[PDB]
Design a protein around this motif. Structure first.
Motif, mmCIF file in Angstrom:
data_model
loop_
_atom_site.group_PDB
_atom_site.id
_atom_site.type_symbol
_atom_site.label_atom_id
_atom_site.label_comp_id
_atom_site.label_asym_id
_atom_site.label_seq_id
_atom_site.Cartn_x
_atom_site.Cartn_y
_atom_site.Cartn_z
ATOM 1 N N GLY A 1 0.811 -1.201 0.000
ATOM 2 C CA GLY A 1 0.000 0.000 0.000
ATOM 3 C C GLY A 1 0.849 1.258 0.000
ATOM 4 N N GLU A 2 0.314 2.309 -0.624
ATOM 5 C CA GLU A 2 0.975 3.612 -0.697
ATOM 6 C C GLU A 2 2.332 3.504 -1.394
ATOM 7 O OE1 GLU A 2 0.760 6.763 -0.304
ATOM 8 O OE2 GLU A 2 -0.646 7.373 1.260
ATOM 9 N N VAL B 1 5.795 9.816 -11.613
ATOM 10 C CA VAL B 1 5.145 11.091 -11.899
ATOM 11 C C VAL B 1 5.406 11.522 -13.340
ATOM 12 C CG1 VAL B 1 5.174 13.543 -11.356
ATOM 13 C CG2 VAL B 1 5.049 11.865 -9.517
ATOM 14 N N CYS C 1 10.350 6.879 -11.794
ATOM 15 C CA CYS C 1 9.719 7.963 -11.044
ATOM 16 C C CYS C 1 8.361 8.172 -11.703
ATOM 17 C CB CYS C 1 10.559 9.231 -11.066
ATOM 18 S SG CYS C 1 9.812 10.623 -10.201
ATOM 19 N N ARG D 1 -1.278 13.981 -8.719
ATOM 20 C CA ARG D 1 -0.964 13.968 -7.296
ATOM 21 C C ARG D 1 -2.141 13.544 -6.428
ATOM 22 N NH1 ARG D 1 4.392 16.108 -6.456
ATOM 23 N NH2 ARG D 1 5.231 15.630 -8.532
ATOM 24 N N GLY E 1 2.358 3.515 -5.443
ATOM 25 C CA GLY E 1 2.290 4.126 -6.756
ATOM 26 C C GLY E 1 1.641 3.261 -7.814
ATOM 27 N N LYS E 2 0.877 2.255 -7.386
ATOM 28 C CA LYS E 2 0.220 1.370 -8.341
ATOM 29 C C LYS E 2 -0.791 2.123 -9.195
ATOM 30 C CE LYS E 2 -1.078 -1.882 -5.402
ATOM 31 N NZ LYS E 2 -0.350 -1.344 -4.224
ATOM 32 N N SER E 3 -1.553 3.033 -8.586
ATOM 33 C CA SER E 3 -2.528 3.808 -9.346
ATOM 34 C C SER E 3 -1.876 4.915 -10.164
ATOM 35 C CB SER E 3 -3.578 4.407 -8.408
ATOM 36 O OG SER E 3 -4.406 3.396 -7.862
ATOM 37 N N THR E 4 -0.758 5.470 -9.696
ATOM 38 C CA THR E 4 -0.109 6.543 -10.442
ATOM 39 C C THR E 4 0.423 6.049 -11.782
ATOM 40 O OG1 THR E 4 0.485 7.598 -8.356
ATOM 41 C CG2 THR E 4 1.620 8.345 -10.334
ATOM 42 N N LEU F 1 12.295 11.346 -4.149
ATOM 43 C CA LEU F 1 12.420 11.591 -2.716
ATOM 44 C C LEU F 1 13.679 10.958 -2.142
ATOM 45 C CD1 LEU F 1 8.690 11.004 -1.787
ATOM 46 C CD2 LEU F 1 9.874 13.190 -2.029
HETATM 47 N N1 LIG Z 1 7.609 12.730 -4.719
HETATM 48 C C1 LIG Z 1 6.970 11.773 -5.396
HETATM 49 N N2 LIG Z 1 5.722 11.470 -5.077
HETATM 50 C C2 LIG Z 1 5.222 10.487 -5.856
HETATM 51 C C3 LIG Z 1 5.832 9.811 -6.876
HETATM 52 N N3 LIG Z 1 4.973 8.862 -7.408
HETATM 53 C C4 LIG Z 1 3.876 8.987 -6.710
HETATM 54 N N4 LIG Z 1 3.967 9.958 -5.753
HETATM 55 C C5 LIG Z 1 2.967 10.397 -4.797
HETATM 56 O O1 LIG Z 1 2.686 9.347 -3.903
HETATM 57 C C6 LIG Z 1 1.262 9.309 -3.707
HETATM 58 C C7 LIG Z 1 0.896 7.969 -3.148
HETATM 59 O O2 LIG Z 1 0.882 7.055 -4.237
HETATM 60 P P1 LIG Z 1 -0.563 6.719 -4.786
HETATM 61 O O3 LIG Z 1 -0.494 6.400 -6.227
HETATM 62 O O4 LIG Z 1 -1.517 7.755 -4.329
HETATM 63 O O5 LIG Z 1 -0.845 5.374 -4.017
HETATM 64 P P2 LIG Z 1 -1.517 4.178 -4.795
HETATM 65 O O6 LIG Z 1 -0.510 3.576 -5.671
HETATM 66 O O7 LIG Z 1 -2.773 4.688 -5.365
HETATM 67 O O8 LIG Z 1 -1.845 3.212 -3.592
HETATM 68 P P3 LIG Z 1 -2.053 1.670 -3.747
HETATM 69 O O9 LIG Z 1 -3.520 1.454 -3.857
HETATM 70 O O10 LIG Z 1 -1.463 1.077 -2.521
HETATM 71 O O11 LIG Z 1 -1.331 1.288 -4.971
HETATM 72 C C8 LIG Z 1 0.778 9.604 -5.118
HETATM 73 O O12 LIG Z 1 -0.608 9.891 -5.119
HETATM 74 C C9 LIG Z 1 1.643 10.818 -5.422
HETATM 75 O O13 LIG Z 1 1.188 11.964 -4.747
HETATM 76 C C10 LIG Z 1 7.162 10.144 -7.215
HETATM 77 O O14 LIG Z 1 7.872 9.657 -8.098
HETATM 78 N N5 LIG Z 1 7.660 11.160 -6.406
#
Ligand SMILES: Nc1nc2c(ncn2[C@@H]2O[C@H](COP(=O)(O)OP(=O)(O)OP(=O)(O)O)[C@@H](O)[C@H]2O)c(=O)[nH]1
Ligand SMILES: CN[C@@H]1CCc2c(ccc(O)c2O)[C@H]1O
Lengths: 300, 337, 282, 54
Positions: free
Chosen positions: A38-39, A273, A271, A106, A41-44, A203
């Protein structure tokens, strides 16, 4: 009735004709499964892939996230200087950017159901889907995914000094290593390759640049580690390059122990993003199939 | 907090005191003089082709002539076993399907999967266009089984450790059942559709009541997950197939485990169980690509059905006890007789 | 007792070549998991091998033992035509299999679209038609006749067998039959080896500090075919380019050396674990 | 704390139920099987003339 069978025989013919059309389409697609803690970046990743290839409620969603972030930091830290020790208490990542395309990326939202994305590159059918449960200690749904092309694994490499949510005494990165070991040594997943995305590279450079919270404190093996001879430090300070390869090496230790030639791990430094990672999946997916045929005919 | 723990232990120990005081003798000693059935061998009569991937679900019809099967390619095909001719083929919105049903009146078919939504299709419709009737969507976790009480009531069980009873007309839950500590994977309504059981991953089964909505009994004689469950034709017993390569028979009135079916050489899991017309045979699938036939009252194996090239994931017996249909992961059904 | 002892040797070759292809023919057709797009070529090759081992070798052995032909002129011509037809239809399948492997490895994504059951059937029918065009048509039309006393004497004799043919037909038949597939097979397997070497290098680059198999396989496959067939198809042109250089015993020995390749083939091919399981079960 | 209170109440409900000996249940099962064994097409093979699938 003699005429009764004639209609039924015609009914089969119309239906059996359609199945041939669907046979060609189904056999010409590749299915990719997203996994990770969890948390991470799977959705990103799945968001930008759809936007790059295929292509008013967000206003309320941003407001809900913004309000929650402010309350937690002001209250919990009471027990500018608050953000310095932000690792002790739980906090979202989008607190700094939202409070002060990219903005839509984001945003964070919890996962319920199943989320699939269809996209094509160079007239090749791809079908990538993420499976979200609040938490499953035991995955009994992992036996269904036994014919996928590859498994995409996303891990946050800038999250070593944090603690998981459900248990407030478990290291976050060490929990990611534990999950990978179980997935790799799975009875069903005996012939499935893994693509590893060491995410959140942005980060990681920030934490190492600041003196506080050295990685040696949490992982004592970092003290005796040295940069590999076959290192291609990209562009980056020598301190940052040493830090990146220590995390990558730990994941490769588990994978290289077993497999017996049917398993392979491809590590990448991403990365999610901004980095253009569309071609990275394509290049490695042609190698997985190419190696599979080479294993046949005893050529490998 | 800790004070009530002492009370819980005494109550739990009280249960075993009464159960151990009613075991007059084992089942085997009672049925020692019964002559064995013999050797049972059957041959494939029909083979059904046409699916593009593995198969998880299967269910017969009340007429015992038509059946419905589900698969992961997204198709829900209806067959006709007498003449081997597909009668329908419904495309599905989601490619992950883990169950299907078939209404007693024959005018509906159900479905479900990892999308946490149950769907109901209409077959006997004007102009011959099958379309989705309802979408029972208020639920969490992947579903595992669906069963039809009548044209309006349906029972679903999922991986969020709950079971619920729906109402198709309004699409809302009439009642919900709670108490399991693990994922639920099977259920089987009684012949009179007044009671049903359910086997979860906490190595236990419970006997619910549809009208009241509360649990009644709990049987805890296993040591691993439970993947299948069936109900004796009498209505006063049921057999459970677990993940430890054993099947056990429980009795509702005596409230104890009666008899255990196991073999030393068998070390694979079990995916489905089913009885016969008179409740004398206990057919059970396996993960080692073949199906074994047991004996209800002797635990003596009496044949092997080994015509499959992959694991067996479903199993069924017609209402009149004429044929046994077994699906597998190689996209082929078979009818034995 | 030269004939008696050597007679078993011909029988052993004839018995094995017929019985070796029965396992491959029966297992592929009867079972379901063994039917694939690439197994149709193997089945066609096995069918050709069965035809040769049933219709060519026994008649030649009987002619060798009895020192005279018995059936007559028409059946002699028919036998020679079957010989040419079945030799040409066995080499040309190996080139198709090599091209199949090359397409499968070099271009993975387009392999699914490029090859289908209809295309495989069409290509097999086309190659069989080409093979049958070279044998029956120029033989039944008496297009290979030689102009000398021995040839006309043999054609007049109704109780003898030989083989005298023109230079032009000989070189054309050799080019159509053996030389053309050889270069294609060489190029295809060189490309496959290069791709395998690159793939091995990539893994070492990724998993460093943690090509015997491909070389052995390609060497076996090419060496068997070359050593069995090239020695016949060099003298087949040498002996017609210049006269009295090569006698007839060497001709027959090299022809039979080429013949035994059909018996050797099912050991080289159809060695998959599924094939072994089918053979053990059956 | 509250959850444990419900569990204790639930268990006491199952504590007081009526039970019979195993012998009666075994006899009932055996009698049912013996009575219905005749019309079991899987046990006793049916003649080929009256077989829908043959
Ligand atoms: N600084 C930084 N922040 C990032 C990067 N990739 C993602 N994030 C941030 O991290 C947050 C947490 O990741 P999410 O994608 O929200 O989490 P998720 O992947 O949806 O969660 P899961 O359901 O567990 O997959 C993202 O929404 C972005 O705000 C990155 O390369 N750099
Ligand atoms: C007598 N046997 C024949 C002689 C000539 C010949 C063969 C095979 C292929 C050819 O292209 C040939 O020209 C041999 O099988």
């Amino acid at each position: 009735q003699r005429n009764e069978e004639k209609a039924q025989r015609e009914a089969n013919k119309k239906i059996e004709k359609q199945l041939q059309k669907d046979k060609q389409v189904y056999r010409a697609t590749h299915r990719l499964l997203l996994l990770g803690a969890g948390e991470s970046g799977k959705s990103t990743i799945v968001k930008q892939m759809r936007i790059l290839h295929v292509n008013a409620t967000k206003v309320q969603d941003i407001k809900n996230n913004l309000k929650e972030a402010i309350e937690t930091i002001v209250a919990a830290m009471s027990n500018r200087a608050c953000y310095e020790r932000s690792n002790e208490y739980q906090l979202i990542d989008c607190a700094q950017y939202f409070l002060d395309d990219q903005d839509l990326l984001r945003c964070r939202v919890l996962t319920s159901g199943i989320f699939e994305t269809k996209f094509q590159v160079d007239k090749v059918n791809f079908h990538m889907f993420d499976v979200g449960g609040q938490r499953d200690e035991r995955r009994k749904w992992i036996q269904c995914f036994n014919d996928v092309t590859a498994i995409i694994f996303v891990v946050a490499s800038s999250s070593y000094n944090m603690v998981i949510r459900e248990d407030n005494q478990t290291n976050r990165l060490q929990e990611a290593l534990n999950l990978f070991k179980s997935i790799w040594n799975n009875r069903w997943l005996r012939t499935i390759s893994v693509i590893l995305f060491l995410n959140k590279q942005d980060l990681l450079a920030e934490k190492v640049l600041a003196g506080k919270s050295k990685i040696e404190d949490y992982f004592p093996e970092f003290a005796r580690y040295t940069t590999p001879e076959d290192a291609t430090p990209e562009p980056e300070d020598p301190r940052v390059t040493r830090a990146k390869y220590f995390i990558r090496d730990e994941f490769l230790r588990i994978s290289t122990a077993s497999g017996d030639g049917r398993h392979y791990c491809y590590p990448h430094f991403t990365c999610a993003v901004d980095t253009e990672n569309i071609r990275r999946v394509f290049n490695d997916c042609r190698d997985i199939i190419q190696r599979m045929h080479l294993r046949q005919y005893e050529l490998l | 907090l800790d004070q009530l723990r002492q009370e819980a232990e005494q109550l739990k120990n009280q249960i075993r005191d009464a159960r151990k005081a009613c075991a007059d003798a084992t089942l085997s000693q009672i049925t020692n003089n019964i002559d064995p059935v013999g050797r049972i061998q059957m041959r494939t009569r029909r083979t059904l082709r046409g699916h593009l991937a593995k198969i998880y679900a299967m269910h017969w019809g009340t007429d015992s002539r038509l059946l419905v099967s589900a698969s992961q390619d997204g198709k829900l095909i209806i067959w006709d076993s007498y003449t081997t001719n597909k009668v329908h083929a419904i495309p599905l919105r989601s490619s992950w399907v883990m169950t299907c049903a078939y209404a007693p009146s024959g005018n509906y078919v159900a479905c479900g999967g990892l999308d946490n939504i149950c769907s109901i299709y209409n077959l006997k419709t004007r102009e011959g266009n099958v379309r989705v009737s309802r979408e029972l969507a208020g639920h969490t976790g992947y579903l595992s089984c669906c069963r039809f009480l009548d044209d309006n009531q349906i029972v679903t069980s999922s991986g969020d450790t709950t079971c619920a009873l729906w109402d198709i007309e309004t699409g809302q839950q009439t009642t919900t059942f709670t108490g399991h500590t693990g994922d639920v994977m099977s259920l089987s309504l009684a012949p009179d559709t007044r009671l049903f059981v359910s086997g979860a991953c906490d190595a236990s089964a419970k006997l619910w009541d549809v009208r009241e909505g509360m649990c009644r009994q709990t049987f805890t004689g296993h040591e691993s997950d439970i993947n299948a469950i069936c109900f004796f034709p009498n209505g006063n017993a049921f057999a459970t197939g677990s993940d430890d390569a054993t099947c056990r028979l429980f009795d509702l009135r005596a409230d104890q485990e009666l008899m255990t079916y196991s073999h030393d050489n068998i070390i694979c899991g079990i995916t489905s169980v089913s009885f016969s017309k008179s409740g004398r045979l206990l057919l059970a699938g396996y993960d080692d690509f073949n199906c074994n036939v047991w004996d209800a009252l002797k635990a003596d194996r009496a044949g092997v059905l080994a015509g499959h090239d992959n694991r067996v994931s479903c199993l069924g017996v017609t209402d009149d006890g004429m044929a046994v249909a077994t699906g597998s992961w190689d996209s082929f059904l078979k009818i034995w007789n | 007792v030269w004939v008696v002892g050597m007679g078993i040797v011909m029988s052993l070759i004839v018995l094995a070549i017929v019985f070796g292809n029965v396992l491959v023919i029966t297992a592929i057709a009867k079972f379901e998991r063994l039917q694939t797009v690439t197994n149709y070529f193997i089945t066609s090759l096995a069918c050709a091998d069965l035809v040769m081992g049933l219709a060519v070798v026994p008649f030649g052995a009987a002619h060798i033992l009895t020192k005279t032909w018995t059936f007559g002129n028409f059946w002699c011509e028919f036998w020679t035509s079957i010989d040419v037809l079945c030799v040409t239809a066995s080499i040309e399948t190996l080139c198709v299999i090599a091209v199949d492997r090359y397409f499968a490895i070099t271009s993975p994504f387009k392999y699914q679209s490029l090859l289908t059951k209809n295309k495989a059937r069409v290509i097999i029918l086309m190659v069989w038609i080409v093979s049958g065009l070279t044998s029956f048509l120029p033989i039944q039309m008496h297009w290979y006749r030689a102009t000398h006393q021995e040839a006309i004497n043999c054609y007049a004799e109704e109780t003898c067998c030989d083989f005298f043919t023109n230079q032009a037909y000989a070189i054309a038949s050799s080019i159509v039959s053996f030389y053309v597939p050889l270069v294609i097979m060489v190029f295809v397997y060189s490309r496959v080896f290069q791709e395998a070497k690159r793939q091995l290098q990539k893994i070492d680059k990724s998993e460093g500090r943690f090509e015997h198999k491909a070389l052995k396989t390609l060497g076996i496959i090419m060496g068997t075919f070359t050593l069995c067939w090239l020695p016949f198809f060099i003298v087949n042109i040498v002996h017609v380019i210049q006269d009295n250089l090569i006698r007839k015993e060497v001709y027959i020995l090299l022809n039979w050396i080429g013949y035994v390749n059909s018996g050797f083939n099912p050991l080289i091919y159809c060695r998959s674990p599924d094939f072994r399981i089918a053979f053990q079960e059956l | 704390i509250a959850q444990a209170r419900k569990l204790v109440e639930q268990l006491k409900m199952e504590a007081n139920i009526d039970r019979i000996k195993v012998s009666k249940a075994a006899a009932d099962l055996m009698a049912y099987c013996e009575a219905h064994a005749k019309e079991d097409p899987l046990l006793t093979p049916v003649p080929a003339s009256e077989n829908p699938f043959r």
